[PDB]
A paper describes a structure:
Trimeric fibre proteins protrude from each of the twelve vertices. These fibre proteins have an amino-terminal virus-binding sequence, a central shaft domain, and a globular, carboxy-terminal fibre head domain involved in initial receptor-binding. The SnAdV-1 fibre head is the first Atadenovirus protein structure to be solved at atomic resolution. Despite the low sequence identity with other fibre heads, the topology of the beta-sandwich is identical to that of known adenovirus fibre head structures and contains ABCJ and GHID beta-sheets (the E- and F-strands in the long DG-loop of human adenoviruses 5 and 2 are absent). However, it is significantly more compact, making the 107-amino acid long SnAdV-1 fibre head the smallest adenoviral fibre head structure known.
In this work, we present the structure of the SnAdV-1 fibre head domain solved by X-ray crystallography, using the multi-wavelength anomalous dispersion (MAD) method. The structure of the SnAdV-1 fibre head domain was determined by multi-wavelength anomalous diffraction up to 1.6 Å resolution, using data collected from a selenomethionine derivative crystal as described. Four monomers were present in the asymmetric unit, three (chains A, B and C) forming the biological trimer and the other (chain D) forming a trimer with two crystallographically equivalent monomers in the crystal (space group I213 has a three-fold crystallographic symmetry axis). Amino acids from the N-terminal T7 and 6xHis tags could not be modelled in the structure due to lack of density, as was also the case for residues 234–236 of each of the chains and residue Lys345 of chains A, B and C. Using NCS-restraints, the structures of both the seleno-methionine variant and native protein could be refined to low R-values at 1.6 and 1.7 Å resolution, respectively, with good geometry and Ramachandran statistics.
Numbering used by the authors:
A (entry chain B): 240 to 344
B (entry chain C): 239 to 344
C (entry chain A): 237 to 344
The structure:
Amino acid sequence: TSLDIAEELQNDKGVSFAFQAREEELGAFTKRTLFAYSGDGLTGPFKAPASAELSSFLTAHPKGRWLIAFPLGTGIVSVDEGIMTMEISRSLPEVGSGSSFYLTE
Amino acid sequence: KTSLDIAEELQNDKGVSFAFQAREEELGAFTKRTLFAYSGDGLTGPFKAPASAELSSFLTAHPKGRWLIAFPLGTGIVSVDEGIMTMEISRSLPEVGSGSSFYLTE
Amino acid sequence: PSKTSLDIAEELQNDKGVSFAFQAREEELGAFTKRTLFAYSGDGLTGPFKAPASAELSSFLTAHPKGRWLIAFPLGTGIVSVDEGIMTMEISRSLPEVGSGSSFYLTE
């Protein structure tokens, strides 16, 4: 019943992230959740080509980007011409997992 | 198995608005209740807003009587009293973002 | 049809009577599978939480590509591992209250 996009992205240094983008209907409301996982660390922003389908999901957020909490820091995921950038609040020795959603009527 | 899944938009007297979802799930001997919260706004202080009777009933059921909830930039505690939600916050938030709080019980 | 292929839940308790509820969930999302550990306690924790876990939960806990589960709670961070059916959750700081959080990974 939920609709999911799932894919693994990699940057030019071989850091890998997996993302799941979920859409759910809750009567008059729709909820869209981005789930993100990496075992790697990041010094700086993660930049990688994303599918057209993930890019379209990412663009739909009312803020135009996805503020996301991980265990050791905060990210903001955006997309421009099919390239994801996730900026980070601090260097992350390990990213771990987190999720960011919105609901709209 | 998902026994309840309601969603509601709440707004305080100064136009800050939140979407809340309340989900109840049955997991064999366990029940799980999850509160999801989203706002694109900031909060300077506690968020106080009228809630539906159904959401209010859900919010009251928690064994702690309130819902400790992590957001990206700070922490909230959501409670309800006669249909009025209060969410107190750990620090002023220039943007709230999303988070969730759940418990499991037998 | 559900995408949930495993959904189990159990209460664990240490020798001091701190109690946690854990839920282990597997979701099949096509080429990818997600495995999530959910953890809840109304208690505080002064130090690592150690408690026996079921065979099924222990198998789930072991499967992670890191061999353990980094998990964010509202007031601090934990790492959940299992060894011979004993869970240990180490914590980043003493927690006057644990609350809830979840840790997942996605695998192809």
